């Protein structure tokens, strides 16, 4: 599921990861979190807010 960061974000949590406005992630599932995805970047998978990205499945 093609992910696209709409804004500049930095991880808050330890299970979360950073992305800059424009990174293309890889949304490797979602479960219960109806506000957070579990996508991939920079060889690290982590939580990212659904409100900070524009998805395209």
């Amino acid at each position: 599921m093609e992910a696209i960061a709409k804004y500049d974000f930095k991880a808050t949590a330890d299970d979360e990861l950073s992305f800059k406005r424009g990174d293309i992630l890889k949304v490797l599932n979602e479960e219960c979190d109806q506000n957070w995805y579990k996508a991939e970047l920079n060889g690290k998978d982590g939580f990212i807010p659904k409100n900070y990205i524009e998805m395209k499945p």
Binding site: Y7, A13, D33, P49, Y52
Partner: peptide, 10 residues
């Protein structure tokens, strides 16, 4: 001015 991040509980 990016959005207010959701209150998570992961």
């Amino acid at each position: 001015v990016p959005p207010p991040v959701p209150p998570r509980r992961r």
